[PDB]
Paper text:
While the cholera toxin is the primary virulence factor, V. cholerae also expresses other virulence factors, such as the tripartite toxin MakABE that is secreted via the bacterial flagellum. MakABE are co-expressed with two accessory proteins, MakD and MakC, which are encoded by the same makDCBAE operon, although their functions remain unknown. Here, we present the crystal structures of MakC and MakD, revealing that they are similar in both sequence and structure but lack other close structural relatives. The structures are very similar with a root mean square deviation (RMSD) of 0.45 Å calculated on 126 Cα-atoms. Both feature a central β-sandwich, one sheet comprising six β-strands, and one with four β-strands.
To determine the crystal structure of MakC, a construct encoding the full length MakC, with an N-terminal cleavable histidine tag, was designed and expressed in E. coli. Consequently, SeMet labeled MakC was prepared, yielding needle-like crystals. The crystals, which belonged to space group C2221 and contained one molecule in the asymmetric unit, diffracted to 2.0 Å. The structure of MakC was determined by SAD phasing on SeMet labeled protein. In MakD, two dimers were present in the asymmetric unit, whereas the MakC dimer is formed by crystallographic symmetry. Both the MakC and MakD homodimers are formed by the interaction between identical surfaces in each subunit, head-to-tail, (β5123 pack anti-parallel to the equivalent strands, β5’1′2′3′ of the other subunit). As calculated by PISA, each MakC subunit buries approximately 1,050 Å2 and each subunit of MakD 943 Å2. In MakC, the residue in the equivalent position is a valine, and there are no other cysteines in MakC that could potentially form disulfide bonds in the dimer-dimer interface. The equivalent β-sheet of MakC is less hydrophobic based on the electrostatic potential map, and the polar residues are more evenly distributed. On the contrary, analysis with MakC antisera revealed that MakC forms large complexes within the bacterial cell, as evidenced by a reduction in the amount of monomeric protein following treatment, which varied with both time and glutaraldehyde concentration.
Author numbering:
A (entry chain A), B (entry chain A): 1 to 131
């Protein structure tokens, strides 16, 4: 019944200096999970139940950078398990979509592309879906 | 020479339901530290060197809440070791100030008051200053 809201946090300075997004990103969600990508790809996940609505938004640690989610691609999108769409006002946009598991329960990989002050960088988070 | 930029992340829904800010806040900074207050007061800290400039800003996980830093009080302010001031445009404000340790090095406690959609709630982070 409750939405799962996900905040991606980017260390933008470091992302741009290295061109490595994964090592410079964190996830915090309303499940009270927090993952650092610096500690591994395995940490960049969200837990959710079939039928739940998911909401993503992205922010930078520094006030001087601007960051947006440009696009989602990959497995979760290919198989139509969750197709987020862009919403909100210019300024704080966010992306939302419902999880349509096939009453299966599984892992769904996806590719999120972010624009970090106009630099497009991709990373590979995943969903863990239970029934 | 580099600024230390600090992002406070609030689970606003949960903060307001409990009236407990500490258990529902995270810190991530450009030192690549991440602390959850849910795991204890001891985690809500920032490392810095004497003479360094510190920058704080606050965001909510959800796009539906608005959150601001209202005020800093307590030890760090009393002793004039770091007096942040408010800056930026309406929308993304932030607070900044330089650390003037007495070439001592120490812990400085402070009280940050945040407005969570108009609800004023306080918590007790701290600085760890080295020379």
């Amino acid at each position: 019944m409750k939405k799962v809201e996900i905040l991606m946090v980017v260390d933008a300075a470091a992302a741009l200096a290295s061109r490595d997004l994964q090592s410079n990103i964190y996830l915090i969600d309303t499940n009270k999970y927090m993952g650092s990508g610096n500690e591994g790809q395995a940490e960049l996940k969200t837990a959710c139940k079939d039928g739940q609505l998911l909401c993503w938004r992205v922010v930078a640690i520094s006030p001087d950078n601007e960051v947006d989610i440009v696009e989602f691609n990959g497995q979760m999108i290919n198989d139509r398990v969750c197709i987020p769409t862009k919403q909100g006002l210019s300024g704080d946009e966010f992306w939302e979509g419902r999880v349509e598991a096939q009453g299966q329960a599984s892992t769904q990989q996806y590719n999120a592309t972010l624009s970090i002050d106009g630099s497009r960088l991709t990373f590979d988070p995943f969903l863990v879906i239970s029934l």
